[PDB]
């Protein structure tokens, strides 16, 4: 699986998820009531959200664009 | 190869692994000393485990049930 990934040093690439990570996610992390950062990448499961951040989890290549 | 797969949005289906992915895995991911989530799917190799999560890797259809 290839997911769009937010570079650890900012920016965005594409990355083949390590074996066992079959979920791409796109999370709109709200830093303020109006501002958010989008985090994208590979994961083993859809990341747990308990702060109501919208999240998109999918299992197809670059589905988290 | 057809592996049991945990849906990216929760749940479980069956999926034909993409070409080059000949391993089904079932990982009991421990979130707490008593609680765990089971992750299942296709992989190119048996996923690396360094946190002692039990893992089952096999190469036959739905062997990771």
Swiss-Prot record, chains A, B:
List the expressing tissues: Expressed by the venom gland.
Q: Does the keyword Signal apply?
A: yes
Please give the Gene Ontology molecular function terms for this protein.
toxin activity
Instruction: Give the stretches traversing the membrane.
Output: none
GO CC, alphabetical: extracellular region
Subcellular location(s) of the protein = Secreted
Q: What pairs make up the disulfide bonds? A: 3-24, 17-42, 46-57, 58-63
Keyword line: Disulfide bond, G-protein coupled acetylcholine receptor impairing toxin, G-protein coupled receptor impairing toxin, Neurotoxin, Postsynaptic neurotoxin, Secreted, Signal, Toxin
User: Secreted among the record's keywords?
Assistant: yes
**Which additional comment does the entry carry?**
Negative results: has no effect on M2 (CHRM2) and M4 (CHRM4) receptors.
Known function: Binds irreversibly to M1 (CHRM1) muscarinic acetylcholine receptors, and reveals a slightly weaker effect on M3 (CHRM3) receptors. The mechanism of toxin-receptor interaction comprises at least two steps. The first step is fast with no competition between the toxin and the antagonist. The second step is slow with formation of a more stable toxin-receptor complex and inhibition of the antagonist binding.
Quaternary structure (record): Monomer.
> Which family does the record claim for this protein?
Belongs to the three-finger toxin family. Short-chain subfamily. Aminergic toxin sub-subfamily.
Q: What is this protein called?
A: Muscarinic toxin 2
């Amino acid at each position: 699986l290839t997911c769009v990934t937010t570079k650890s040093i900012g920016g965005v690439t594409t990355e083949d998820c390590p074996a066992g990570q079959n979920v791409c996610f796109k999370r709109w992390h709200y830093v303020t009531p109006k501002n958010y950062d989008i985090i994208k990448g590979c994961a083993a499961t859809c990341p747990k959200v308990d702060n109501n951040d919208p999240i998109r989890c999918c299992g197809t290549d670059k589905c988290n664009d």
